[PDB]
């Protein structure tokens, strides 16, 4: 049972690290999409120009 | 002059015991002896845990 608890602790640390890495990738995508959508004018503006 | 046990006898949990302790909060001592005597059709264990 002690071995089970040690391996469970190492696995929960692994899960946390992997979830955080994926969250950082998603956050990068989110931020880039956000700025890209910020600087984009709408269709009527660009077709008029 | 009397012959006495030199040291304590050690009780250990088996992997089956670990499974039943994690899932059911219960341990049946010497699980495998029971299971073998149960599937072989033998009504009596030879010894106690």
Swiss-Prot record, chain B:
Localisation: Virion; Host nucleus
Role description: Self-assembles to form an icosahedral capsid with a T=16 symmetry, about 200 nm in diameter, and consisting of 150 hexons and 12 pentons (total of 162 capsomers). Hexons form the edges and faces of the capsid and are each composed of six MCP molecules. In contrast, one penton is found at each of the 12 vertices. Eleven of the pentons are MCP pentamers, while the last vertex is occupied by the portal complex.
Family stated for the protein in its record: Belongs to the herpesviridae major capsid protein family.
Self-association state and partner proteins as the record states: Homomultimer. Makes the hexons and eleven out of twelve pentons. Interacts with triplex proteins 1/TRX1 and 2/TRX2; adjacent capsomers are linked together in groups of three by triplexes, heterotrimeric complexes composed of one molecule of TRX1 and two molecules of TRX2. Interacts with scaffold protein; this interaction allows efficient MCP transport to the host nucleus. Interacts with capsid vertex component 2/CVC2. Interacts with the small capsomere-interacting protein/SCP.
UniProt-recorded name of the protein: Major capsid protein
Gene label: MCP
Complete-protein stretch covered: 295 to 343 of 1370
């Amino acid at each position: 049972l002690d071995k089970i608890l040690n391996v469970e602790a190492m696995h929960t640390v692994l899960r946390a690290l992997k979830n955080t890495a994926d969250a950082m990738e998603r956050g990068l995508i989110h931020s880039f999409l956000q700025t890209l959508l910020r600087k984009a004018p709408p269709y009527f503006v660009v077709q008029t120009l | 002059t009397v012959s006495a046990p030199a040291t304590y006898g050690n009780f250990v949990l088996s992997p089956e015991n670990a499974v039943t302790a994690i899932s059911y909060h219960s341990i049946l001592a010497d699980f495998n002896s029971y299971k073998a005597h149960l599937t072989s059709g033998q009504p009596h264990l030879p010894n106690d845990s």
